[PDB]
Amino acid sequence: AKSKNHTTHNQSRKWHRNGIKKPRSQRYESLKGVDPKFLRNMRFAKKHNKKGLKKM
């Protein structure tokens, strides 16, 4: 026999039982997906930071 096809009825009621939570936020966000050429230099910058340790 034929049956119902589609509905979103009752769906926003379900979504809100445990809340529509926003994504979690951390002060440090991962560098995944940033420009590879830019990231290569940022690692070189971090690597030699200890050179200027005495001046600081």
Binding site: Q11, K14, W15, H16, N18, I20, K21, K22, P23, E29, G33, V34, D35
Partner: protein, 159 residues
């Protein structure tokens, strides 16, 4: 059912405004976008490269990556009962600096100035905003003029 086409339903969304077609003004390419910038995404049909998907049209996100032509934007997207932080690569024709924070950055400097100034005068000045309060008592002068009497007008069939 509907199709899963990428640009379905964008007949008006991506079209150019009335009598605003043709060349893209070059100040669109001179804007400087840094990491951490808030930008409003607005797809533009004139440029078909780096187009944001329709769901990201009219949303505002944060820039996390800058390439030669595009930026990476972390923009929230609600899918059923969850909100995902989505990372999209959009060409800089389809974004614009958001003014949503400028009112805030204006207030901080005004706040930081007033906070500093009031401190060296030994006074307290309000820094937090407030909702508009109820109007306070005042006098309304008649000026020796009786208020104009108003009456409802008779019905008229102006058919």
């Amino acid at each position: 059912t509907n199709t899963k086409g990428k640009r379905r339903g964008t007949r008006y969304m991506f079209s150019r405004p009335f009598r605003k077609h043709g060349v893209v003004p070059l100040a669109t390419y001179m804007r400087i976008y840094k990491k951490g910038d808030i930008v409003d995404i607005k797809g533009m049909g004139t440029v078909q490269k780096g187009m944001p998907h329709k769901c990201y049209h009219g949303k505002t996100g944060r820039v996390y990556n800058v390439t030669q032509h595009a930026v990476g934007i972390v923009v929230n997207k609600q899918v059923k009962g969850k909100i995902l932080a989505k990372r999209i690569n959009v060409r800089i024709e389809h974004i614009k600096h958001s003014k949503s924070r400028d009112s805030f950055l204006k207030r901080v400097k005004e706040n930081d100035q007033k906070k500093k100034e009031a401190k060296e005068k030994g006074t307290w000045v309000q820094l937090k905003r407030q909702p508009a309060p109820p109007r306070e008592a005042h006098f309304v002068r008649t000026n020796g003029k009786e208020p104009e009497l108003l009456e409802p007008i008779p019905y008229e069939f102006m058919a």
